[PDB]
A paper describes a structure:
Extracellular matrix binding protein (Embp) and its subdomains referred to as the F-repeat and the FG-repeat are critical for adherence of [name] to surface-immobilized Fn. Embp is a giant 1-MDa surface protein consisting of 10,203 amino acids (aa). High-resolution structure analysis of F- and FG-repeats revealed that both repeats are composed of two tightly connected triple α-helix bundles, exhibiting an elongated but rather rigid structural organization in solution. Both F- and FG-repeat possess Fn-binding capacity via interactions with type III subdomain FN12, involving residues within the C and F β-sheet.
The C-terminal repetitive region (aa 4511 to 9509), also present in S. aureus homolog [name], is composed by a row of 40 repeats consisting of 125 aa. This repeating unit is referred to here as the FG-repeat. Similar to the F-repeat, the FG-repeat reveals an elongated shape approximately 70 Å in length and 20 Å in width and height. A- and S-modules are connected by a shared helix α3, lancing through both three-helix bundles (the length of the central helix α3 is about 40 Å). The FG-repeat is characterized by a remarkable strong dipole character. The N-terminal region (A-module), formed by the N terminus of helix α1 and the N terminus of helix α3, is strongly positively charged, whereas the C-terminal region (S-module) formed by the C terminus of helix α6 and the short helix α4, is strongly negatively charged. Consistent with F-repeat analysis, the chemical similarity of each individual amino acid is low between individual FG-repeats, but the prediction of secondary structure features is well conserved. Although the overall amino acid sequence identity with Embp is only 30%, the structural data for the FG-repeat at 1.55-Å resolution reveals high structural homology to EbhA and strict conservation of all major structural key elements. Here, by strong interactions between subsequent FG-repeats, the dipole character of the FG-repeats likely supports the SAXS-deduced, elongated rod-like structure of repetitive FG-repeats. Importantly, the KD for rF-repeat binding to Fn was determined to be approximately 4.0 × 10−6 M, which is substantially higher compared to the KD value obtained for the rFG-repeat, i.e., 1.6 × 10−9 M.
Residue numbers in the entry: 1 to 126
The structure:
């Protein structure tokens, strides 16, 4: 019923508000997506997507936040400039996503690609 759909949207938006991986712009974009759904099945699909995106954003935030530890404890200080530049480029791309205010991507594949670029570059420093 209409009351069932309204309640499912409210629940989903409340869950999204609790997430810590997603940025506030990402939460707002997803809450808007939730509000536009016409069935509870579709609300659940979008909430499942938000939960997965939240996990990837958690992974991305860790990969970016650990950069100073990596610079200090890996071979970064001794490494060739190409490897150091690749790492800083990848970290900067991750920072761009996290700090974005204008319509941040809600594409988990885009996030996963950025995570993988950081992880690949970090691996070459160990």
């Amino acid at each position: 019923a209409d009351q069932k759909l309204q309640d499912a949207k409210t629940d989903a938006k409340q869950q999204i508000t609790n997430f810590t991986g997603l940025t506030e712009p990402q939460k707002q974009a997803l809450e808007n997506i939730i509000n536009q759904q016409t069935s509870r099945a579709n609300v659940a699909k979008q909430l499942s997507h938000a939960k997965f995106l939240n996990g990837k954003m958690e992974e991305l935030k860790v990969a970016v936040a650990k950069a100073s530890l990596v610079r200090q404890n890996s071979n970064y200080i001794n490494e060739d400039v190409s490897e150091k530049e690749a790492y800083e480029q990848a970290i900067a791309k991750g920072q761009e996503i996290i700090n974005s205010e204008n319509n941040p991507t809600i594409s988990s594949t885009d996030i996963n690609r950025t995570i993988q670029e950081i992880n690949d570059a970090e691996q070459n420093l160990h």
